[PDB]
Amino acid sequence: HLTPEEKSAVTALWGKVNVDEVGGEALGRLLVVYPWTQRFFESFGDLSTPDAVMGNPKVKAHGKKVLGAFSDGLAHLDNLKGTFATLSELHCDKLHVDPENFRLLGNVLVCVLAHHFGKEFTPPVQAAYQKVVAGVANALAHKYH
Amino acid sequence: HLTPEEKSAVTALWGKVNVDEVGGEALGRLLVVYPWTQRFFESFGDLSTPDAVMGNPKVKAHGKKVLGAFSDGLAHLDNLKGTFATLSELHCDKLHVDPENFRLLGNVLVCVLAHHFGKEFTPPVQAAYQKVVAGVANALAHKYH
Amino acid sequence: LSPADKTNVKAAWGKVGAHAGEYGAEALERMFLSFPTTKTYFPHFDLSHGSAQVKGHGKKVADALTNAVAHVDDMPNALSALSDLHAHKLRVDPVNFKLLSHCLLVTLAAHLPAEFTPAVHASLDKFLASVSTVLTSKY
Amino acid sequence: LSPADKTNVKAAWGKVGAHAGEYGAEALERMFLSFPTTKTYFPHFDLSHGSAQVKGHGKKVADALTNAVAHVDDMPNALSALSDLHAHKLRVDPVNFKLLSHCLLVTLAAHLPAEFTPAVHASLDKFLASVSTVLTSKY
Ligand code: HEM
Ligand code: HEM
Ligand code: HEM
Ligand code: HEM
């Protein structure tokens, strides 16, 4: 649950997020830092080096999709469980992704936001975004509960 | 979600469980194998050696309580969330116990059951009990969700 | 891994003896039954009860564990090829190693009551975690 | 770790320079704000924003990390007293080390954009995990 101050700060920061590169950066960094996640993306082409990962158009497009899903969850902060029902079904009963990777990707996204915004990404803003990503990961891992 | 045959096997094995020692054994083994959990039990006296942990009457008395809670959950396999509401409140808001420790204790209890029952603790029975302990841990960790 | 852990692990795995392959196959069966998501790493395997493929894989895993016990102080060097396999070619999720370690502990508890004291349990848990992190160290 | 990981970590932590104490204090502040359950380990601490106690503790943690970087191939021996503290006296849950490592990574990303490349990020993650498992080794 987020306080109105946290919601306002999160919305103000997300309004300045570049939706064409942030998701791709987060997905690429997830692949580089946790290379076992590359097992789920063997149809994306070359993932042998970090530069090849960050330069992959498939990774960029899929990161765009994931960032769109995150924006969808951010637009409905009180119905994350119903916002992510079909995505939870896809990720659990079809892709068999272990739910710890959801938390890993959320923390990678937090790191990417910190990298992009610098001093603007204050500790209170980070705490609000940690709440948001924890909620998103919990909603996505509902099918395992 | 347990099938009727899994439920029958689980309740048939649980009927032969010594309710005065199994919980104490599980709690003592949790304290020995993951000794950071000893931080929650400083009021239990001596915990310096494994022999002192397994000989502790407070650890035995508490393990008995925890085994009783597990039995209560087993009698209400379809209402685990409502069965463990107050225990979840106590463990999250009051004691600040990380939810990974719940899974650790459940696996320790599975190991204790395997140790006591030997060959009759078959892989299907263990799978049903893993389902049970996962459900119990999820119900206890709900207040963090 | 304290020297006490190494002393406990060596004797406990020594009393395993010639039952190592059977214990490994049983641990694999327990993992497949309790955590069916681990079965996705073996699509080409016949994973029914009593499978000879599962028996052979259990023998291989048990032999690897015996080698790791014999090379406890030099495990990262002794398990370089297995780490290469599991991290580069297989890229197994590290939670699966925790699952398999738990199933190995359950098999050991169900087959060696006298040996599975709390201290031996702690030592075996630490040894299996060290083996797992060696096998995932190539990430 | 790897030679490449060690080189990346050494270069990145060298670029930290004289801001190590400030970065450690900011990482501690971030951890206390994002994960209030970590605050229970500091009941005698003034944990408000700008606290001198938090500043000093951040300086100590940063100096420990600098020593660990200087002794990356002998970290278990270099961090023996700290691991003794954190495992015997404090009994810190290991999850807390992951939380603090994440907050350190966030601080490094927010203060060193050019240095925080994906490869440097991976190397720093690996180094912080190694430090954490050394500090929880005694368990
Ligand atoms: C944590 C938050 C996550 C969000 C919000 C998210 C979101 C999405 C979205 C929007 C799609 C596209 C669905 C569609 O086009 O119908 C997708 C598919 C996919 N996700 Fe995620 N994802 C997350 C985490 C992960 C993680 C951690 C992994 C792997 C380690 C993963 C693996 C995949 C794969 C392989 C696909 C493609 C499969 C397919 O399209 O059938 N996801 N996800
Ligand atoms: C995983 C399943 C668990 C169950 C079913 C369980 C059950 C219980 C029960 C029945 C009580 C007594 C409540 C009362 O008397 O009102 C209790 C209290 C307590 N539990 Fe657990 N427990 C579990 C896990 C854990 C774990 C993993 C830890 C620590 C690592 C823990 C720490 C404690 C402590 C310190 C108390 C004492 C609280 C007090 O004295 O006020 N519990 N638990
Ligand atoms: C202590 C833990 C483990 C040990 C000692 C171990 C050991 C081994 C060994 C010795 C082999 C055969 C290598 C060869 O024949 O050259 C192997 C292969 C394999 N392992 Fe593991 N392993 C462990 C954990 C795991 C886990 C947790 C998984 C998946 C959940 C896994 C999946 C596989 C797969 C898929 C193969 C390939 C089998 C084949 O292609 O026939 N391993 N492992
Ligand atoms: C990045 C890993 C960490 C490092 C390098 C580190 C380093 C240190 C250092 C240098 C000290 C001071 C010891 C002295 O005075 O000589 C210390 C104390 C302490 N650390 Fe950590 N620490 C780490 C992680 C943690 C975590 C995750 C917690 C728990 C949230 C924690 C809790 C404490 C506590 C409670 C003290 C004692 C504070 C006091 O009484 O002054 N540490 N640590």
Side-chain angles (χ1 to χ4, degrees), chain A residues 2-145, chain B residues 2-145, chain C, chain D:
Chain A
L2 272 82
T3 72
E5 259 191 311
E6 281 167 341
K7 272 156 183 271
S8 175
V10 154
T11 279
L13 206 89
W14 201 255
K16 295 134 46 63
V17 157
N18 186 18
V19 296
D20 292 298
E21 328 275 26
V22 166
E25 265 134 28
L27 182 60
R29 282 178 183 262
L30 180 80
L31 292 174
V32 170
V33 176
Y34 309 109
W36 64 86
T37 57
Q38 264 165 237
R39 209 221 170 192
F40 302 98
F41 297 98
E42 259 137 29
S43 77
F44 277 27
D46 192 2
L47 305 169
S48 75
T49 56
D51 295 49
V53 166
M54 306 307 279
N56 198 314
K58 296 233 189 123
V59 175
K60 198 184 143 160
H62 186 65
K64 211 150 145 53
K65 301 281 236 335
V66 180
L67 204 65
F70 262 106
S71 318
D72 206 341
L74 267 167
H76 310 97
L77 276 180
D78 298 324
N79 199 23
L80 293 177
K81 190 71 37 143
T83 313
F84 289 116
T86 88
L87 280 173
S88 187
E89 293 182 277
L90 175 76
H91 283 80
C92 302
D93 297 314
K94 197 270 217 163
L95 297 167
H96 314 124
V97 190
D98 158 61
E100 178 61 47
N101 313 282
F102 302 149
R103 214 273 290 131
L104 290 183
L105 179 62
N107 273 356
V108 165
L109 178 58
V110 165
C111 282
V112 169
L113 293 177
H115 190 230
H116 279 233
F117 293 109
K119 260 214 82 83
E120 220 167 356
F121 203 70
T122 62
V125 168
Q126 189 216 333
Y129 267 106
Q130 295 281 171
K131 274 158 145 233
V132 167
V133 299
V136 166
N138 280 324
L140 201 56
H142 178 63
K143 282 319 287 295
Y144 286 127
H145 299 341
Chain B
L2 276 80
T3 69
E5 149 176 26
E6 291 188 293
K7 274 158 172 273
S8 170
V10 154
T11 69
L13 196 88
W14 201 255
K16 315 143 52 142
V17 159
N18 194 357
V19 305
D20 286 87
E21 328 274 29
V22 162
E25 262 134 31
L27 174 59
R29 282 179 183 261
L30 180 81
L31 293 175
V32 166
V33 176
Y34 310 108
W36 65 85
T37 56
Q38 288 179 26
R39 207 187 154 241
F40 307 97
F41 294 101
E42 326 103 316
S43 63
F44 278 28
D46 194 3
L47 297 176
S48 40
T49 56
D51 278 353
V53 178
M54 311 297 285
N56 194 314
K58 299 222 201 77
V59 162
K60 232 148 304 132
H62 198 55
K64 212 158 136 53
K65 266 145 155 261
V66 174
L67 201 61
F70 261 103
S71 294
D72 273 329
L74 271 162
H76 297 100
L77 283 172
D78 292 324
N79 198 23
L80 289 187
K81 190 70 37 153
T83 305
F84 293 106
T86 85
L87 282 173
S88 191
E89 289 144 47
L90 163 82
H91 285 78
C92 304
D93 308 328
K94 204 262 219 163
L95 302 156
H96 319 287
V97 176
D98 191 76
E100 178 61 44
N101 299 313
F102 303 148
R103 213 272 289 139
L104 290 186
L105 182 59
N107 274 356
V108 167
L109 172 61
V110 165
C111 283
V112 169
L113 293 177
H115 187 232
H116 286 28
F117 291 111
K119 191 168 217 330
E120 103 188 284
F121 198 74
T122 62
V125 159
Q126 173 201 351
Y129 266 106
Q130 295 281 171
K131 272 154 147 224
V132 169
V133 299
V136 167
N138 279 324
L140 203 58
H142 181 75
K143 265 46 210 292
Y144 286 126
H145 295 357
Chain C
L1 268 280
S2 80
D5 311 359
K6 302 168 208 253
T7 317
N8 267 323
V9 161
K10 295 198 190 83
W13 198 257
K15 323 278 316 313
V16 162
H19 302 267
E22 186 222 291
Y23 293 175
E26 194 206 326
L28 281 168
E29 202 215 335
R30 286 174 181 286
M31 191 191 61
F32 291 143
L33 282 193
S34 292
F35 317 106
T37 194
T38 59
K39 262 152 38 153
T40 66
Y41 290 96
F42 303 81
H44 55 324
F45 268 49
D46 171 52
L47 296 178
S48 60
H49 180 67
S51 164
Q53 235 177 329
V54 177
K55 269 188 216 181
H57 194 62
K59 301 190 217 93
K60 276 178 196 171
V61 176
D63 289 344
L65 287 176
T66 306
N67 182 58
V69 167
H71 297 255
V72 47
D73 287 324
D74 196 35
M75 270 192 325
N77 185 46
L79 299 172
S80 34
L82 277 182
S83 324
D84 264 321
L85 181 76
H86 285 84
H88 303 70
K89 295 95 91 163
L90 268 40
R91 53 217 334 155
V92 182
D93 201 315
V95 308
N96 295 308
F97 286 92
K98 275 175 262 283
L99 300 174
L100 186 54
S101 289
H102 169 67
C103 289
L104 281 153
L105 284 189
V106 162
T107 296
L108 289 180
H111 286 278
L112 301 173
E115 277 62 65
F116 205 72
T117 65
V120 166
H121 180 176
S123 298
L124 285 166
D125 182 80
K126 278 166 306 213
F127 168 70
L128 291 171
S130 74
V131 169
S132 299
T133 186
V134 171
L135 290 193
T136 48
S137 77
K138 295 269 166 92
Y139 284 127
Chain D
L1 263 56
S2 302
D5 288 327
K6 295 166 209 254
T7 316
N8 265 325
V9 164
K10 274 217 61 91
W13 200 249
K15 303 290 312 263
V16 177
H19 306 269
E22 192 219 286
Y23 293 175
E26 190 207 327
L28 282 168
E29 205 215 332
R30 276 161 190 297
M31 194 195 51
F32 293 140
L33 282 192
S34 293
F35 317 106
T37 194
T38 60
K39 261 150 91 203
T40 64
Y41 290 94
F42 301 82
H44 58 326
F45 265 55
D46 173 51
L47 296 177
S48 60
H49 180 69
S51 162
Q53 218 163 347
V54 174
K55 260 183 221 182
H57 194 64
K59 293 176 225 123
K60 274 142 163 213
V61 177
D63 289 344
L65 287 175
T66 308
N67 185 59
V69 170
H71 297 253
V72 67
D73 287 322
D74 195 41
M75 273 188 359
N77 185 45
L79 296 172
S80 49
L82 274 182
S83 33
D84 261 318
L85 183 68
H86 286 83
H88 300 69
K89 289 136 257 176
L90 308 173
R91 311 203 115 100
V92 185
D93 206 300
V95 302
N96 289 309
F97 287 89
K98 274 175 262 283
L99 299 177
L100 187 52
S101 292
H102 170 67
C103 290
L104 283 153
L105 283 195
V106 164
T107 301
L108 288 178
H111 285 275
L112 297 174
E115 280 56 68
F116 205 72
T117 63
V120 166
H121 179 177
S123 297
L124 287 166
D125 193 74
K126 278 166 252 151
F127 169 69
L128 292 172
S130 73
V131 176
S132 294
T133 185
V134 172
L135 290 192
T136 59
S137 67
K138 313 267 147 116
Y139 297 128

